[PDB]
Symmetry: D2
Subunit: 112 residues, 4 copies
Amino acid sequence: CPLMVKVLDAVRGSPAINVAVHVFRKAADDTWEPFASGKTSESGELHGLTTEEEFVEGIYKVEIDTKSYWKALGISPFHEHAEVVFTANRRYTIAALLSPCSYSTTAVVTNP
Amino acid sequence: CPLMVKVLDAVRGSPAINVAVHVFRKAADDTWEPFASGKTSESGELHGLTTEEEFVEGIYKVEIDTKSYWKALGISPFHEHAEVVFTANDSGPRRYTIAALLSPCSYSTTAVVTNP
Amino acid sequence: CPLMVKVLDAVRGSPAINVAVHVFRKAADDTWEPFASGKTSESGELHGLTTEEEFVEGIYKVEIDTKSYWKALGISPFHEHAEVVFTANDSGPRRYTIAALLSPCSYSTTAVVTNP
Amino acid sequence: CPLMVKVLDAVRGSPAINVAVHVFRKAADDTWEPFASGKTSESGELHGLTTEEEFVEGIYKVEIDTKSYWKALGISPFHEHAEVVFTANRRYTIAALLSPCSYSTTAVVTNP
Ligand SMILES: Cc1ccc(C(=O)c2cc(O)c(O)c([N+](=O)[O-])c2)cc1
Ligand SMILES: Cc1ccc(C(=O)c2cc(O)c(O)c([N+](=O)[O-])c2)cc1
C-alpha cells in the first residue's frame, strides 16, 4: 500500500474507529474525481486504498467524515469534515488527530 | 468583526505574515460562492473579512494559502492549502476565530466561538 | 508584558478559562525556583506574569494545570499537566506568547516570539 | 509491550529517527526515578521500554530530547525538551508530533 490513512481521537485517547474516508484525484478539468474510500479499522487505520500502479503523481484530496464520527459519539462537532489536499511525488501515511472543535494532520512519508 | 482568521508559523515561532485567505459560502445550488478574502497582517491576524449583517447562517469554507506562504520562504510544503469548513450561526450570531498553526508537512486548526 | 500564556479548549471551541499557570526559573544550583503564577482570564489569556526588568536570561518552565481544568468540567484527562520548558532572552529581550490547545487526552503547544 | 513512544517530524513529514527518550516513575518521595529509556527507530517508534509486570499503576514522566534532534538537523529549536506526564490505569502509546517551535502529544490507549 502506497497510501494509508490513520485517524486518532484526542478526547478518548484512542484510535478513531469506523471513520469514513474518501480520496479524490484532481482531473484535467480540475474536477475532483473519486479515487478510493473506506472506513478506519479498530486501530484507526485504513489500508489498501490503492495500488502502486494506480497511485500516479498528481494532486489528491482526502476527505475525513469527522462530523459523523462525533455525531455517533453524541458530541457536538465544529467542522463539516476534514480535508487534506497534497501533491504525490514512496509510501504516504496521512494522519489526523481529531477533537470536536480542532484537528491536526501530518504527512509521514517513508521509503522502503 | 464576527469572523477572524489567525495563522502562526511553527518553524519560526512567529505569526505567519502575508498569508492569503479566501472565504466561500455554500449557495442554494450547492456551489461555493466567493464571500470574502484578505491577507494576514504582521501579527498573523486577518480582521475585517465581513460584517454582522453580511455573515448570515450558512456553511462556510476558509481556504488558507499555505503553499504560497512556504514557497515564498524557499520551502516546498506537503499540502496544497488548508481548508476549514463549518456551519456558522445555526443557533444565532456568534463570533468565530479560525486559527491555524503551520509546519511544512503538517498543520492544525481550531475554532474559538464566543457569544458577543 | 514580555511573557503571556494563552490556553484554548479544543472540545468546546473556546478559551480555556480559569486555568492555573505556574512559572519557574532554573537557579544557579540547578533547582527550579518559583517565578510567577496566575489564572487565565475569560479570554483564555494570562497577562502580567512578569516585567522587562524581572524577566532576565534563563531557562523557564511554564506548568499549565490542565488536570484541574478538565476535572472541574467532569472529565478525567490523561495528562497530569502540560509543561513547557525553554531558554528565554539568550540573544536579547524578546516577547513570548506560550499558547496551548487542550483536549482531554492530548495537547499541543506553540511559541510566538517577537522583537518589541 | 504495554508502553510505546512514537515521534514524528512535522518539518520533514517523516518519522523522527534517533530521538532520545527517557521515562521516569514518581517515587513516594515525589522524586522522579529513572524507569526506562531508548532511541526511536527508523519508523520513529520506541518499543520494549518495559514489561507488563514492571509497568504498575502510577505517575509516569516521558522526556523527549527534542533539542538534540533539531540540533542534529541544523534547525534552531525553541524548547529544551518535551515532557509528557500521565497516570497509568491496557497498552499505551504516547505519540509526539514535533516542530522546531511547537509540539503536540496524544495518548492512544487500546485493549488487546
Ligand atoms: C498549539 C496551538 C495551536 C493553535 C493555537 C491557536 O489557534 C491560537 C489561537 C489564538 O486565538 C491565538 O491568539 C493564538 N496565539 O496567540 O498564539 C493561538 C494555539 C496553540
Ligand atoms: C500529537 C500527534 C498527532 C499526530 C500524530 C500522527 O500523525 C501519528 C502518525 C502515525 O503514523 C501513528 O501511528 C500515530 N499513532 O499511532 O499514534 C500518530 C502523532 C502525534
